[PDB]
Every structure is written in structure tokens, then in C-alpha cells.
């Protein structure tokens, strides 16, 4: 058999896309999308009338431009994800403005407005994934969140200071990034090749998931972001990973079976004091990794939210 | 006459160094210290009867280990300070510790303490800046310092978003660094080489100088760290500026008066609302270079200050 057909025997496979062609080949059980994939998204053509459709809905809710401008973004996002929603069985993760990573009030509002609109389509929460930046204002908004029925997908996890504030906070998910670690130490170290076991993503994600598996959280473990299958390959037994495209189609197209690789067979131990804010932000820090990936992340979701909402601007 | 002289007409000169010697040859107002140089400082063998000193008085004070290493490591920062101020007429800047950098009521009890060994000495406030490194919390602390009788000097300066809510916060004075700004872009940045007018660390601080007097803010502003006598000489006119013994001799043996470089002649204009701590977070991590530069800095202080434990701890 091929390798994708192996991989789903001990990982759930994960679309990292907002095209639904891709939903139709590799049929996954879950999909996710972010700034940057939406802002692609827009660009094919046959998507075309669902960007019509949210300016349309726009212009229907209010007058003002400004306004427009937002439901029609927000609209869009959620149009998109309506129509992964018809092809795959399980959720969509659906990212809130990445300019609101800092603000926690303001970033509750947004998840729930975004809520709002899935629901006035029919859509009920348990298909969906608010995903937020895990700065500590993204993980205190998914603690609350969580409590009002709403899940969240806690992306753009570097550091382990992240990973241990995300389960103790109790969110549905997590998204601990594995290619943009590399990426960072290609370029910022002297070693520029890695073998798969010692690749840093590799590396950084196992480590988390025995700490979540050993100490019973419930939180979901999904790697994300790969610069190879090689990466993938080592995960193999992560609860879920989701996957671009192009590497879906090399593991589609690799005969041979694969082994698990992240298991953990051990008892639960007890879990410790939580972490606080104070100790949260110096152990993030002591990480020159984490510091960096995190914050050019959240620009750079920034940057495509605000080419996004010039677009339809240009629209109004 | 020479470049010194000549600078002292526009700008308060301050040595950035422990060691006593460099205090006697310039006659600085000012000196600063900071976990590092504290470090090299106890390496001077003049120093050994500061330590032994500072040994000595720890174990009267108590039987535990653990809290003689920690009163024998700040006594040595303050008994080095007190031989500073013997040669000096202004102030001593003396840092807490860098681990605490994001922890502000830990800040604040140790700036008391550190306050309380120089009022035990005889030494009032007015001689002293305790020096706490720019995160959001070390400016929360330092705003509640000031309100106390404390003054203190806000270090590791990089982005405008820290400049202005020090100066929002009505902190005594800042140190916005010069050099390791240069260092950054050096290393991240095709341009290998500045003219001191388009040095990006200059800019920095003439962009911050102007910004504080346009809006008529009392916070003094203090440049540091220098890699040439070009960074020095193109912030002429700065409130004062702090510098290594090394460029404090090449410019009191360069003969030639120098022009007066920073300077606002207008009138002051109305402040702004406050900024918020979403929006300093937001802003900061706009800025790549104050992102990996606020954190490398506290990294390093800890790592010296930790360093200075081991030795003390030898000794006990």
C-alpha cells in the first residue's frame, strides 16, 4: 500500500488548505486554514462566487463601509469553510484576525462573532475550530472560550512554555509547528541538513506529546507545518497532523508501509502547579527560537489579513 | 581642545563600567553598572576586599546558605557602587535581578531591598537609579518605584513602543541602546556599513530625543552602548550618555571641537491618551530587531548573574 493509506492506520490525516479540490482527492477527516491560506483561497477562480456572496451578504447587514469591509472579510472566511464542511466529516479551523494576538478581550469577541456567523449558516460548534495565536492573551481567550462551548486550535506553538500553559488552560487542540523550527535553524545555525530523528520540529513536537500523553491531557496533539515527508514519516502516530497538499500527494504516491513511531505506554502521572504569567513569559523567552517564529508568525498573518480586506475593498 | 571636553559643553558624560580607575581618569557625573560588568568587576584584584566584605557581612545577617549567597552577591553590587560614589557627584545605576525582568512585584521587593542595603550604608535615594530591564513589566514596576521615592533607570530600550511607555510611565530616566542595535542589522541585514548619520541604533535615539522634548517629557535621556566615537559624536546634545572606558580615552586624545547634533527648538505639544499593554505588545513585536534584542539582553544579564552566584558561593 501506499504511504498516506499507512499513515491514517495510527494518525488522523489533516487537509492544510482551503482549496476543496484537495478535500476530494485525499478525502481528510478534518481541514484547517489560516490568514495566508484564505487570502490564496481567494485567488481561484471558481471561489469567485463565494466572494460575491460575502460582499453581497455584507452590503445586506449595514451601510457602512467600514463594516462592510469586515463582515464581508469574516464572511468570506466562513463561506470557505462552509464549503469544506460538505466534503469532509469532521472540522474546519477557522483563524481569527491575527492583529488581535495581543488583546484577549478583543479576541474573545472576534471567535464569537465568527461563531455567530457558522451558526446563522446551520453550522453547530462541534464542526468547528477557533484557531488563535498562542500568545498568553490567545491562551487566557481560549481558556473562556472553551468554558462557553466554543473549541479552539491553538497554532503558532513554539516554545514548551506554550505547549504546558495550552494543556493546563484545557483547549480542544493545539497546533505545535514543525517545518518553521527548521526553518529558523538553517538559517541561524551552522548545521543546514538534518536526518528526520534529529530534525528540531521533529524533535520539539515528540517532546510535547509524551508530556501531554504522560500526564493525561486531553488536548489534542496536531503537527503542523512540513518542509518534507521525511518530518511527517517521524510523527507517524501523532494524534493528527495536517498536511499541504503537495506533500499529501508524495505520500499518496510512496509505496511501503510505515511504522509508529510516538507512542507512549506508560501510566498517567500527576500533573504539577500551573504555570503563571511571570514564568510563562521567561521561559518563552530563554528560547531565541520561539521568540523570533512567534512574532514574525503573527505579522505575517497580519500583513495577508490586511491584503485580504483590500481586496474586497476594492469591491464595495 | 579634545573631543571630551569639548562634548561635556552639550552633554552630561557618565561611565559605563565598575571599575573605580576609569572614574578618577574622566571625572564622570554619572556612572552605570549592570549584572555584567559587576561580573567583570569582581575579577579586578583591587576588588578581592569588596567581596570578602560583602562575605562577611552576608553570614552575619544569617545561617542559611541559600540567602547567603543571595545577600553576599547584592551586597558586592552595592559595596561596589558605594566606592563609586566616593569619586563621583551624581548617581549609581545598579541593576536587579535580570530573572525577575518579567516579574513586576519580584522587581519591585528586590529594587527595595537593593534600596535598603545603600540606605543601610548611609547612602540616600537621590545618589541612586535602581536599573530594571524595559519589558511591559519592568515598567509597571518602575512607575510604582518613582511613586515611592525610588528613581530608576529603564535599560534595554530597542523599539518606540518602549520608549513611550517609559516616558508614559514618568520613569527618571531611559537608556535606549545604540550599538547593539548596529550589531543586529550587521548581522541580519546585507549592509555591512554605516555612516553615523544613517546608523540605525542614532536614529533610534534622535527619533526618541525628539519625541520626548516635542511632548515635554522629564525622563532623561541617556544613550548607550557604543561601538565607535562616530555614534558618540552624531548624539551630541543628548540629556547625557554613558560610555565604555575604552571610547572615553579615543576621544579625550582626539583634539577638535565637535557641533551640537540633537536638539528640539520647538514648542512642546499636547500628549497622546496612554498606550495600552495590547497595543505596547502589538507594537514591540512589529519591530524584528526589538523582539530578538529585548530578550538576548535579559538572557545574558541572567546568565552573568548566575555566573557571580557560582563564585560567591565558592567562597562561602
New interface residues.
Given amino acids: 500500500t501506499d504511504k498516506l493509506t499507512s499513515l491514517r492506520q495510527y494518525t488522523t490525516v489533516v487537509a492544510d488548505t482551503g482549496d476543496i479540490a484537495a478535500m476530494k482527492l485525499y478525502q481528510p477527516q478534518d481541514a484547517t486554514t489560516n490568514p495566508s491560506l484564505i487570502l490564496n483561497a481567494a485567488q481561484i477562480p471558481e471561489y469567485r462566487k463565494l466572494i460575491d456572496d460575502a460582499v453581497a451578504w455584507a452590503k445586506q447587514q449595514s451601510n457602512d463601509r467600514a463594516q462592510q469591509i469586515v463582515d464581508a472579510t469574516d464572511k468570506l472566511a466562513v463561506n470557505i469553510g462552509l464549503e469544506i464542511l460538505k466534503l469532509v466529516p469532521g472540522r474546519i479551523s477557522t483563524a481569527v484576525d491575527a492583529?488581535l494576538?495581543?488583546?484577549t478581550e478583543?479576541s474573545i469577541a472576534k471567535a464569537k462573532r465568527l461563531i455567530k456567523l457558522y451558526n446563522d449558516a446551520g453550522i453547530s460548534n462541534d464542526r468547528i475550530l477557533i484557531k488563535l495565536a498562542s500568545?498568553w492573551?490567545g491562551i487566557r481567550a481560549a481558556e473562556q472560550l472553551e468554558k462557553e462551548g466554543i473549541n479552539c486550535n491553538l497554532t503558532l506553538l513554539f516554545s514548551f512554555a506554550q505547549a504546558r500553559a495550552c494543556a493546563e488552560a484545557g483547549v480542544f487542540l493545539i497546533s505545535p509547528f514543525v517545518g518553521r523550527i527548521l526553518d529558523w535553524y538553517k538559517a541561524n545555525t551552522d548545521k543546514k541538513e538534518y536526518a528526520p530523528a534529529e530534525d528540531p520540529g521533529v524533535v520539539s513536537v515528540s517532546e510535547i506529546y509524551q508530556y501531554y500523553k504522560e500526564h493525561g491531557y486531553e488536548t489534542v496533539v496536531m503537527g503542523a507545518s512540513f518542509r518534507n515527508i521525511g518530518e511527517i514519516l517521524e510523527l507517524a502516530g501523532c494524534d493528527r497532523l495536517t498536511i499541504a497538499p503537495a506533500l499529501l500527494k508524495e505520500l499518496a504516491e510512496s509505496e511501503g508501509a510505515i511504522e509508529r513511531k510516538l507512542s507512549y505506554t506508560g501510566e498517567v502521572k500527576a500533573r504539577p502547579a500551573r504555570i503563571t504569567?511571570?514564568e510563562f513569559?521567561?521561559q518563552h523567552?530563554?528560547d531565541?527560537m520561539a521568540?523570533?517564529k512567534l512574532?514574525?508568525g503573527?505579522?505575517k498573518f497580519a500583513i495577508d489579513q490586511e491584503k485580504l480586506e483590500k481586496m474586497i475593498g476594492d469591491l464595495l
Same sequence: chains 1, 2.
Fill in positions: 492583529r494576538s495581543y488583546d478583543a500568545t492573551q504569567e511571570s513569559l521567561w523567552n530563554q531565541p521568540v523570533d512574532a514574525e503573527i505579522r
